[PDB]
Amino acid sequence: AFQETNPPAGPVRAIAEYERSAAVLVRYPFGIPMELIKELAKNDKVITIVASESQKNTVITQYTQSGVNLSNCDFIIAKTDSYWTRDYTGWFAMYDTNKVGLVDFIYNRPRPNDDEFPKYEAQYLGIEMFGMKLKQTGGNYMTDGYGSAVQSHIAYTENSSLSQAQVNQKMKDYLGITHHDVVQDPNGEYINHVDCWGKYLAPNKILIRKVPDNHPQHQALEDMAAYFAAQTCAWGTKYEVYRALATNEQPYTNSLILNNRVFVPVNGPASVDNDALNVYKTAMPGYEIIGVKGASGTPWLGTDALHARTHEVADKGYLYIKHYPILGEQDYKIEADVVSCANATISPVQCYYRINGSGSFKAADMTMESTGHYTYSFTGLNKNDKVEYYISAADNSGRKETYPFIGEPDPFKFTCM
Ligand SMILES: NC(=[NH2+])NCCC[C@H](N)C(=O)O
Ligand SMILES: [Cl-]
Ligand code: NA
């Protein structure tokens, strides 16, 4: 059962789903199609939860027979009640400047084995765990990686013995959340999970479910989209609000962002799926958008699909780039904090840039002003010049990261004004 602990030594920063992932967590007996596991294992480590050595051998045989990349397959032996790894597995946070930790909570379901799982996850990953005494579920949580978290109202109503202020304080203490945006769920369904209607695609992008004009939740969802469209994101610009039209409860927001690939559940008709996949492609240049059909025995549902049955795993040796970009009409100095959770040697730290969209991107070394603090000034440009840039860093543990994560295909853009 859940065990409360003191929060992590600060400062704390919750890691977003679109940050670097070292693996993805799935569970057996499966709630996902084998084709999805095969596609995930092609590029990423797939950790499968099984209850015993016998179940591990059964899964190995299924993976082997289906041509799954076994070199990217590992296992955790732990009892579980369900395959909703999104909802009961631990949440990732950076803390004490150079560490990655796991945050446990009271799973809001009568599933004691699922509730106990984060202890096994932290042990497997070789990371510390912290017990946040809140009734929570991963399906109802998303962070932008800049201290904001969006959750439906059950984050308050399922913690009714605490004031909203005490609930907010726990999110701040254990996950570094400074903006706990608890909203009235606009879907009118029993589940009240953010992932059934909303998803941050980047710190400045949010996807909000859209339904036909006649649907009873049409105005609630339009109001939610307008609410995000009118607010300033972590980067100081208004959110880019994208909409995925569900003509018949297709769970298009219930996708998985895993490194440079996005796994979107598709239920049909093909024309409606194609429109939703093209919204992701428009919103996320450089990402591989993959439509995934459901398993006939455990199909995708409006309230429960691909995101619900997966959970990304952060990199405990994460080469992290902290940066607030210079954007739009605009001193033209960028600053970035670059820290290695592996305590690896960081070199080089570069700014890749392009002027007026001409030619290839050019690299310039950033200056290290103080430990882990890098700067670069844009100089010798002309008024009305347009700039594209991104940050690039590598370390001697073989890690290579860009900011934004996808790098060159979606650079930061500003105009010399
Ligand atoms: N992240 C999610 N959408 N989770 C769906 C969980 C569905 C499951 N039947 C429950 O209510 O527990
Ligand atoms: Cl403690
Ligand atoms: Na738990």
Numbering used by the authors: 44 to 373, 377 to 463
Please share excerpts from the published article on this structure.
We further obtained a substrate-mimic complex of DTDP-untreated wt PPAD with dipeptide aspartate-glutamine, and a true substrate complex of DTDP-untreated PPAD–C351A with dipeptide methionine-arginine. The complex structures are equivalent, including the backbone of the bound dipeptides, except for some minimal displacement and the differing side chains, so the substrate complex is taken hereafter as reference except for issues dealing with C351Sγ, for which the substrate-mimic complex will be referred to. This causes H196 to be rotated ~100° around its χ1 angle toward bulk solvent and Y233 to be displaced by 4.1 Å and slightly reoriented for its side chain to bind the substrate (see below). The guanidinium group is further tightly bound by D238 through a double salt bridge with arginine Nη1 and Nη2 atoms (2.9 Å and 3.0 Å), by the main-chain carbonyl of T346 (3.2 Å away from atom Nη1), and by D130 through a second double salt bridge with arginine Nε and Nη2 atoms (2.8 Å and 2.9 Å). The aliphatic part of the arginine is bound between the hydrophobic side chains of I234 and W127 (both 3.7 Å apart). The C-terminal carboxylate is linked by a double salt bridge with R152Nη2 (3.0 Å) and Nε (2.8 Å). In addition, one of the carboxylate oxygens is further bound by R154Nη1 (2.9 Å) and the other by Y233Oη (2.8 Å).
Uniquely among microbes to date, P. gingivalis also produces a secreted PAD (called PPAD18), which protects P. gingivalis during acidic cleansing in the mouth through ammonia generated during host and endogenous protein citrullination. PPAD does not require calcium for catalysis and is genetically unrelated with animal PADs and, like the latter and cysteine peptidases, its main catalytic residue is a cysteine (C351 in PPAD20). In contrast, PPAD citrullinates C-terminal arginines like those generated by the prior action of Rgps17, which may be facilitated by the surface co-localization of Rgps and PPAD20.
